[PDB]
Design a protein around this ligand. Structure first.
Ligand SMILES: *[C@@H]1O[C@H](CO)[C@@H](O[C@@H]2O[C@H](CO)[C@@H](O[C@@H]3O[C@H](CO[C@@H]4O[C@H](CO)[C@@H](O)[C@H](O[C@H]5O[C@H](CO)[C@@H](O)[C@H](O)[C@@H]5O)[C@@H]4O)[C@@H](O)[C@H](O[C@H]4O[C@H](CO)[C@@H](O)[C@H](O)[C@@H]4O[C@H]4O[C@H](CO)[C@@H](O)[C@H](O)[C@@H]4O)[C@@H]3O)[C@H](O)[C@H]2NC(C)=O)[C@H](O)[C@H]1NC(C)=O
Ligand SMILES: *[C@@H]1O[C@H](CO)[C@@H](O[C@@H]2O[C@H](CO)[C@@H](O[C@@H]3O[C@H](CO[C@@H]4O[C@H](CO)[C@@H](O)[C@H](O[C@H]5O[C@H](CO)[C@@H](O)[C@H](O)[C@@H]5O)[C@@H]4O)[C@@H](O)[C@H](O[C@H]4O[C@H](CO)[C@@H](O)[C@H](O)[C@@H]4O[C@H]4O[C@H](CO)[C@@H](O)[C@H](O)[C@@H]4O)[C@@H]3O)[C@H](O)[C@H]2NC(C)=O)[C@H](O)[C@H]1NC(C)=O
Ligand SMILES: *[C@@H]1O[C@H](CO)[C@@H](O[C@@H]2O[C@H](CO)[C@@H](O[C@@H]3O[C@H](CO[C@@H]4O[C@H](CO)[C@@H](O)[C@H](O[C@H]5O[C@H](CO)[C@@H](O)[C@H](O)[C@@H]5O)[C@@H]4O)[C@@H](O)[C@H](O[C@H]4O[C@H](CO)[C@@H](O)[C@H](O)[C@@H]4O[C@H]4O[C@H](CO)[C@@H](O)[C@H](O)[C@@H]4O)[C@@H]3O)[C@H](O)[C@H]2NC(C)=O)[C@H](O)[C@H]1NC(C)=O
Ligand SMILES: *[C@@H]1O[C@H](CO)[C@@H](O[C@@H]2O[C@H](CO)[C@@H](O[C@@H]3O[C@H](CO[C@H]4O[C@H](CO)[C@@H](O)[C@H](O[C@H]5O[C@H](CO)[C@@H](O)[C@H](O)[C@@H]5O)[C@@H]4O)[C@@H](O)[C@H](O[C@H]4O[C@H](CO)[C@@H](O)[C@H](O)[C@@H]4O[C@H]4O[C@H](CO)[C@@H](O)[C@H](O)[C@@H]4O)[C@@H]3O)[C@H](O)[C@H]2NC(C)=O)[C@H](O)[C@H]1NC(C)=O
Ligand SMILES: *[C@@H]1O[C@H](CO)[C@@H](O[C@@H]2O[C@H](CO)[C@@H](O)[C@H](O)[C@H]2NC(C)=O)[C@H](O)[C@H]1NC(C)=O
Ligand SMILES: *[C@@H]1O[C@H](CO)[C@@H](O[C@@H]2O[C@H](CO)[C@@H](O)[C@H](O)[C@H]2NC(C)=O)[C@H](O)[C@H]1NC(C)=O
Ligand SMILES: *[C@@H]1O[C@H](CO)[C@@H](O[C@@H]2O[C@H](CO)[C@@H](O)[C@H](O)[C@H]2NC(C)=O)[C@H](O)[C@H]1NC(C)=O
Ligand SMILES: *[C@@H]1O[C@H](CO)[C@@H](O[C@@H]2O[C@H](CO)[C@@H](O)[C@H](O)[C@H]2NC(C)=O)[C@H](O)[C@H]1NC(C)=O
Ligand SMILES: *[C@@H]1O[C@H](CO)[C@@H](O[C@H]2O[C@H](CO)[C@@H](O)[C@H](O)[C@H]2NC(C)=O)[C@H](O)[C@H]1NC(C)=O
Ligand SMILES: *[C@@H]1O[C@H](CO)[C@@H](O)[C@H](O)[C@H]1NC(C)=O
Ligand SMILES: [Ca+2]
Ligand SMILES: [Ca+2]
Ligand SMILES: [Ca+2]
Ligand SMILES: [Ca+2]
Lengths: 388, 388, 388, 388
């Protein structure tokens, strides 16, 4: 086995087609299934896996009470083949309340953060072995992507932020080789309060679309040069913005350079990617809350400030149903690199108070250059049928 | 690994021998097992798998209520090694309320249809990656075989129908290479309403025996030329007809060319195959309902209109037990190609109203050129022992 | 991969050491575990598996009621790695109420008998594919070994009896090559009623020690010539006899040639093997019932009629606990072939009537040339803690 | 594959980073999970596994009652990939109420002791086969390490003790090659009572740190010459001692040569390792009971009697939570050999009497040469939420 390079152009797509759905919450009502959140998807060259942060309990279990809290010592990174639900035989790959994973063509790298909020440890696990670690550098909360990292030619890159709810954010970009940290670069350019990057290979570089936690409903973009470790950043140009909350479509804006100061907090993890002058992106259908999900393309939305010219809309989850985080992953075909995405479907607290638990399922779609129809693919659990 | 060609003569069989049984419903009464329907079986060169359309729930689970409905967004295609029941570690391979799968010698192809009734999407997944998609061409329930597709020399063929189950039904035959659609041919010949084809290789071509949903209790036959993509069709010659409902054996008929207009609707998925002038075929034992199952050969039943000369009858499931859909799969031996079949054993609604769910198990038989005995292998669950 | 030949001498042993235990019944009281009987063990060159005939149900399940009956259509052959209990992910390899399995160095062969009592079918499954079948030749009850068959240089041999409670037994030895029956030899020599052979390779031939159902508490022996397909048979010489029931040790006998006419019915499946003039053997501790288990060597017990000279006795299961069938399997080391055995530990009906089910666990021991101590390794479940 | 030699220097570590946690007890309250104790970890060159001694039952199962008792015939050695909890599909690798395991670069060796207290058997299983066995030499509870053995160049070593727990016991060091015992050496040097050694490679030799059961709260050290089979022993020099119970830090001592006679009984399994003149070690935080866990380095604590100079402390489990046994394992990187450890987190009896069972989970950490933060990673189960 050789290192992956992702050295192919991006597939020209017309939209997205259904790929996978796990039905975790529906299954939790008649079986032993992990309580989770912050899922994502990543593929080795041989196959695709779903990941998530467990809460150290199954759902029909009294320890599921209070699982809205993000950071406890019992959280571990779960890894299962895509489509296989998170049952009791699922592997806990490392201890983590924040994570990122990727495969370099030879082995899996996992970045796993756990410990005290303000003095955390990030472990780097390469090929099933502990290879390196780093402590929190600012003693705010050290956190990472909650989606796949990206490796080119044996060098993997991951974005991390040591930040706090007060809008403090010290963002650094790590370069890692067989689990060893070989360089760390500070964030540079105009992006301001970066969390939870969704990154993708754009050979010879890497590009991330992130979450502005504090001041922008427009999404930050980071460019990472894999050859000399230099960094740049800005915001997605599209006047149809990707975060939640946000203004409505006729009053929303972006100038490509600065956070837009429109309903900037708290934001939600999401994704977007460039196709020439155009941008493909997802977002929640609601402007206020994490409900529904839609994808579309914005013509000129990548290079012209404030374009609002959409086309190729699809509903993924209708607006009567809960969504959550979303993110990108990439797949190498014979001649081109395809872009896919997942949507976290959160059930329970805080929106549904009949139960005491918090958990999610997922749905996944992939780029197609064929044709397709319409639908809606929500979580599908009836909250009244669940353990409490 | 090379592509499969199926370029051997058909095994001369004397009947069928027991091969596999999954006991799903019996197991569902003391364990977490998936609710399913529309199962089938397909073998790679290395092993066999069972497939089915899940209902996004286990059986001992309140979400099993109402699983008589065919099309919900939570249906996924389940895949498990043959004989491993559909438990909670089962892989959901794609989102689907109608499907077909086959292995081309290198990798698995799955065809997965989901979404709105009037605007569905069919996804094509090859080697674990999304390779193509199509949208509905008549806007009235795009649907496919619910059994294995067939590949020769890297080209896979699958039959799909869209449109009104009564009138203006539009059947198309797709040709697919590594998951990309390379050609689509319209149905041609005298077959009139086609659904749920059971197909098999007949080198260098492919042949399918289908279900006439509307006017015929005699089964349609479709021939598919894999060299030039041309199509022909007619009806199985045998005066002993294969659909349900049907007339009794002394008043049933077929003229090879047209639907017989004898109790044509609604039909059931089934199979048949040719051996020279003879046909081997399965059907339900009851002429009225989906109860029992029997196989036999009809001498001259392939090439002479209205032959009623049977031999080699076997009871697979006795007429005191429910059956369901059935279909064919093929297996390559060292010197010949064998034919096998599966029977869906449907339990619950509509026939059994003590419970609120609908599900199935399977039983599977394969051609033999040896000797064999008799028996009956029904589902075996006691409806009174079940969750409700 | 090449075919196995088992062309190594037998390891010289001093006794047996503990190898595996599955604890099935103890686990069944707090988990979903298959109901089974007639287990055995067999190893491919890479690993060992435990096998058993399921009853189409888990134990904590209302379908476990009435599982004392030996022959229903829902019985399937279960296969799991040795030490992994028979849980819901266990593979049902074929449909069977009697079976035998073995690995030829390239693939698994399973012999699986199911159907009507008096008109059964035996299927032969090689490398996951149905390769042949045979019907009952006498229309009594067709049955096979309930332990491993043996393959040498690509030819596998298995012993089958088509027999009935009226002392009738038509015994045949089959020779099978990649799942095809290539020859069938009748039983020959002085053994009279043969059931449930425990067989082992003894290069270039195969040797079996069986159960006499009717006239002998001394065990029949069969020799199988793998070059010309000829057969011979006789009875184990040892005056300490291996069947149950049997006379006590001072009044028991064998003349090497004939059944001893001492408490000959019904017997139990068991094993023995030769080491020069000596025999190693197991048997129940009780002379009346299937309780306890012990092993020992009888000096001159293989070649001198009526030798009662035991040495190296070990208790495996003490005489306050239920045993059951036992059998032999063989393991290829780098320089020699070791002999190992399993004991079925039957719980429930008919001996324990608080419950309505019958099932078993197993314990497994292997030949050692070292030293060892003492113990007792029974099933260990408390019948009062079980589902009913 | 070649034999492992561990012929690299020890990684220069700055402390330990989080690696794995299994959450067994928390899962256990809503799922079928094995009752265990005496866990450990060991890695093949390809992956890591967790091991433990099962109690022949799951926790939500009436057979869990009374599982404080250490030695029953139903105890088996459980083996699972690190992070996969001990669920019903877990492999039981051998029968054992005491064990040790290790990989020599080609295959797994397991040492498994079971049977009567006064006449036990130790089985040696190599590459899934029984290879050798030994009987008890002092007739008073033959027992071994409860952590990984160590192999260099194909020869594996394991330390065993038989005889009175707190009298004179008879400790022997076994040398094993492909499962065959090739030499046994008696303990030699000044160590007096030895139990439950934690051993590691220190090329070309092996070094163990053990438990003095009777007279010392300072830990015995054994040196094992792998080429010559010669043995030496003494006590860890550090005045900060590693056993439990022990005196407080200002009145504790060690003279490197003798047990310190300070609260010597009963002790607990633990570990330490040398780095030049320094020692790295773990211990319980409490001096009286098995509560909490901490690691640190003692400067000059390996070569100067009574050093109390600690640095680089880390809390692993805080002192409001139960700990248990701990031990070491080693991992081969590209340029150096890393040291890792596990901690057993015991729940239930005798400390927690609301329930009738005893079981544990684990947490695992590995050496790092990077930086890290702080935390506490206890078991996390609420005793009030558990089956009784
Ligand atoms: C079966 O399923 C298919 C596949 O899912 C469905 O087809 C979808 O339908 C989507 C919804 O209609 C559609 O996406 C929309 O696209 C329009 C842009 O539409 C175009 O306008 C441009 C601009 O010059 C033009 O390029 C287009 O091309 C024509 O020809 C081309 C080929 O050359 C082809 O693309 C076209 O089909 C067409 O023949 C076409 O004219 C966009 O405006 C839509 O966005 C508005 O509407 C949605 C609601 O659907 C809102 O949520 C948005 O906010 C937005 O509305 C705002 O903006 C409006 C101003 O534009 C304003 O009027 C509103 O008030 C509001 O402020 C949306 O992006 C897909 O492109 C199409 N996909 C494909 C592949 O065709 C099909 O409908 C299904 N059929 C059935 C029966 O269900
Ligand atoms: C143990 O297991 C085995 C294997 O399963 C069982 O063997 C089965 O048994 C099946 C039922 O009998 C049988 O299938 C039937 O086949 C007959 C055709 O049989 C032949 O008839 C022809 C000529 O017309 C004849 O020449 C044949 O030759 C004999 O001798 C030669 C020697 O050279 C040899 O080649 C042959 O093997 C045979 O020994 C032979 O007799 C067929 O007629 C049956 O069809 C009617 O019956 C079934 C009920 O069984 C009805 O449901 C059907 O609807 C059908 O009924 C129509 O037929 C009549 C004529 O019109 C009419 O009365 C009715 O009203 C109706 O209209 C059926 O298909 C298998 O062939 C046989 N398999 C084999 C391999 O032998 C065995 O029975 C089991 N034993 C026990 C003890 O349980
Ligand atoms: C710890 O564990 C070990 C191993 O598990 C225990 O030592 C076991 O003990 C077994 C039980 O005693 C024993 O098996 C017995 O063997 C005797 C035969 O004993 C031998 O006699 C021959 C013949 O002259 C002689 O060669 C032997 O000398 C030595 O050399 C051999 C080398 O080949 C070696 O095995 C030893 O080193 C050995 O000392 C030796 O003297 C046999 O007579 C026993 O069978 C009778 O007793 C049992 C009860 O155990 C009955 O159930 C039988 O039916 C049988 O009784 C019949 O015959 C009697 C004599 O005529 C008569 O009185 C009765 O009424 C009846 O008709 C039995 O098979 C093992 O060989 C020995 N194993 C080993 C490996 O050494 C040790 O006991 C354990 N310790 C503790 C404290 O638990
Ligand atoms: C985020 O996480 C990190 C990593 O976990 C935490 O950092 C660790 O913090 C611990 C706890 O403090 C440190 O361990 C302690 O080490 C003490 C010795 O180090 C200091 O003293 C020596 C000289 O004797 C100095 O040389 C040191 O070095 C300084 O400079 C060097 C550069 O050369 C750097 O290494 C350092 O960064 C410093 O800048 C240190 O200043 C050691 O004394 C201590 O042991 C006592 O304390 C504990 C409680 O912590 C007791 O339980 C224990 O019994 C010992 O107590 C006895 O000791 C004395 C007298 O004998 C008395 O004080 C007591 O009463 C008692 O009798 C412990 O081992 C650890 O080294 C450090 N790790 C690293 C890599 O730095 C961060 O704190 C955490 N941050 C936050 C914000 O949470
Ligand atoms: C989850 O835990 C909460 C808080 O511990 C439980 O609610 C409490 O119930 C007790 C009585 O058992 C009251 O005295 C408290 O005042 C309640 N607190 C709150 C915040 O409501 C709750 O019942 C637990 N949920 C479940 C399903 O057991
Ligand atoms: C399954 O669901 C059905 C309907 O979705 C339930 O039946 C209804 O129960 C309601 C509420 O009690 C009644 O008012 C209605 O008359 C019922 N509807 C129908 C169509 O009968 C049914 O009880 C559910 N079954 C189970 C076992 O939960
Ligand atoms: C297992 O099945 C048996 C036999 O069917 C059940 O016992 C019978 O129940 C009938 C009808 O309900 C009673 O009238 C008889 O007293 C029983 N008949 C016989 C022949 O014993 C038994 O109840 C079942 N066991 C469980 C646990 O459900
Ligand atoms: C676990 O088993 C123990 C041992 O029998 C039970 O504790 C005893 O309970 C019996 C009656 O059930 C009492 O008479 C004894 O006094 C108890 N013994 C001791 C030492 O306290 C206990 O009931 C069982 N626990 C559970 C949950 O079943
Ligand atoms: C199977 O597929 C291959 C690839 O298409 C075929 O390859 C050959 O056949 C072509 C058509 O006859 C030739 O003109 C090509 O040059 C040639 N290509 C290669 C790579 O050999 C092959 O014939 C097919 N085999 C069968 C039995 O249909
Ligand atoms: C990547 O890596 C090596 C050197 O580190 C180089 O030789 C190789 O040719 C490179 N390949 C690609 C695709 O970048
Ligand atoms: Ca924002
Ligand atoms: Ca019809
Ligand atoms: Ca007998
Ligand atoms: Ca001590």
């Amino acid at each position: 086995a050789e290192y992956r390079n992702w050295s192919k152009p991006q597939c020209q797509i017309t939209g997205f087609a259904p790929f996978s759905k796990d039905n975790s919450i529906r299954l939790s009502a008649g079986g032993d299934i992990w309580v989770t959140r912050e899922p994502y998807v990543s593929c080795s060259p041989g196959k695709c896996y779903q990941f998530a942060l467990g809460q150290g309990t199954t759902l029909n279990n009294k320890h599921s009470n209070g699982t809205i809290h993000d950071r406890i010592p019992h959280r571990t990174l779960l890894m299962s083949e895509l489509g296989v639900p998170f049952h009791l035989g699922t592997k806990q790959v490392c201890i983590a309340w924040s994570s990122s994973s990727c495969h370099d063509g030879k082995a899996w790298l996992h970045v796993c953060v756990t410990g005290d909020d303000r003095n955390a440890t990030a472990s780097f696990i390469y090929d099933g072995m502990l290879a390196d670690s780093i402590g929190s550098w600012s003693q705010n909360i050290l956190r990472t992507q909650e989606s796949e990292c990206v490796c080119i030619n044996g060098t993997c890159t991951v974005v991390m932020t040591d930040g706090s709810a007060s809008g403090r954010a010290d963002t650094r970009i790590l370069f890692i080789k067989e689990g060893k940290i070989v360089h760390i670069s500070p964030l540079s350019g105009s992006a301001q309060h970066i969390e939870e990057c969704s990154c993708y290979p754009r050979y010879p570089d890497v590009r991330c679309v992130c979450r502005d936690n504090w001041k922008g409903s427009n999404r930050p973009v980071i460019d990472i040069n894999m050859a000399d470790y230099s960094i740049d950043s800005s915001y997605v140009c599209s006047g149809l913005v990707g975060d939640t909350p946000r203004n409505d479509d006729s009053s929303s804006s972006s100038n490509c350079r600065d956070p837009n100061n429109e309903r900037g907090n708290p934001g939600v993890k999401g994704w977007a990617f460039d196709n020439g002058n155009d941008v493909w992106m997802g977002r929640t259908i609601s402007e206020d809350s994490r409900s529904g999900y839609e994808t579309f393309r914005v013509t000129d939305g990548w290079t012209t400030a404030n374009s609002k010219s959409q086309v190729n809309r699809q509903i993924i989850v209708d607006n009567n149903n809960w969504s959550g985080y979303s993110g990108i992953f990439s797949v190498e075909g014979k001649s081109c690199i395809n872009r896919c995405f997942y949507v976290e479907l959160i059930r329970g607290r805080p929106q549904e108070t009949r139960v005491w638990w918090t958990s999610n399922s997922i749905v996944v779609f992939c780029g197609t250059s064929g044709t397709y129809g319409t639908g809606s693919w929500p979580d599908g659990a009836n909250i009244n049928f669940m353990p409490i």
